[PDB]
């Protein structure tokens, strides 16, 4: 997450921090972002789980904010189901079908209970996306620069603009490694962008003046690199898939 603000207690309450467990009593390691799309379901990126696709390796945190008091009873979740898209594949640079679903529960078996700091995010209407050039917002704990190694301590959000496939599929962009199950987004000034460690996190667009999960941070050459937008899994083309694994 390069070049944004730090979020607060009612900014991006659907954001989910996905951590990988370490052996022993070592604290866990931050692995990916994610979005609460149902009280029991978080959507993220498959490429985040392909090395260790067993649910036992992860723990999910919700309600993150500098003004929110951590309560492990309501904000920490075990993963009782880990579903990766069955046709997830890795290409030269791009991921295909880069989407995953995590079914979550607290230590007492409950789902996420809504609050000032925890809300679900709406899925888009089928095959419906905001127009290109819309302002979408991105969020994460990822690097604040391509060159930076340090990860930030607290949640950042920024604003990018949707980029058309025609513009994105130009050779000096990404050429044929973009398909229509992806969504490109960038800063027209190329100063703000998502980065390493934002993977699986939300791309939030308005659709009918409703905040909507239009994308899942998936990939990109560099971070905030001129002529090179962030590529997102286009959620509107996966709705059947999502609602087939839930309901």
């Amino acid at each position: 997450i390069v070049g944004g603000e730090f979020t607060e207690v009612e900014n991006q309450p659907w954001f989910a921090a996905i951590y990988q467990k370490n052996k022993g009593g070592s604290p866990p390691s931050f692995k990916c972002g994610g979005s609460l799309i149902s009280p029991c379901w978080v959507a993220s990126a498959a490429h985040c789980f392909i090395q260790l696709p067993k649910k036992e390796n992860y723990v999910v945190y919700l309600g993150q904010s500098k003004e929110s008091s951590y309560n492990p009873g309501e904000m920490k979740f075990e993963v009782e189901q880990l579903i990766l898209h069955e046709y997830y594949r890795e290409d030269s640079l791009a991921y295909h079908n880069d989407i995953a679903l995590l079914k979550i529960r607290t230590s007492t078996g409950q789902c996420a209970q809504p609050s000032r700091s925890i809300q679900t995010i709406a899925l888009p209407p089928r095959f419906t996306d905001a127009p290109f050039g819309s302002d979408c917002e991105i969020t994460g704990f990822g690097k604040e620069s391509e060159s930076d190694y340090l990860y930030p301590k607290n949640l950042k959000m920024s604003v990018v603009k949707l980029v058309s496939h025609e513009q994105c599929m130009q050779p000096h962009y990404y050429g044929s490694e973009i398909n229509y199950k992806m969504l490109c987004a960038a800063d027209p000034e190329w100063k703000t962008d998502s980065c390493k460690g934002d993977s699986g996190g939300p791309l939030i667009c308005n659709i009918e003046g409703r905040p909507t999960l239009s994308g899942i941070v998936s990939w990109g050459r560099g971070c905030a690199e001129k002529n090179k937008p962030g590529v997102y899994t286009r959620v509107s083309h996966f709705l059947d898939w999502i609602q087939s694994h839930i309901g």
Partner: nanobody
Amino acid sequence: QVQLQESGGGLVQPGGSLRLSCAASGFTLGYYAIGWFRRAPGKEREGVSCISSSGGSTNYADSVKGRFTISRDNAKNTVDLQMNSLKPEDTAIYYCAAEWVPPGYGATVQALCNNAGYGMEYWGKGTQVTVSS
């Protein structure tokens, strides 16, 4: 092979003092926020007092304010609970619990303490504190 272990339980005269200690083995307790929780006969588990991993933040139940004092030694891998001016009402099983607080939250350990300890990762077997004539 991760273990939390309480010690210090016993039988003390009302108004007397008693110190509990929680020691860890198999891991570094210093990364973890620690809570002391107690279950009295008949009532449900309640947060007595809590402390953050660096020690900067503490929380106390209203019942024990000014009487109980939590502290820790991250060099020695321990957390202590000093209990002064003990009252019969304090008679209970005292448990030590440890939870890693992720980054991105408030500095407070208030919510960690007021919620009966649900979700705390690690728990000791508990030790007995009895206050009686």
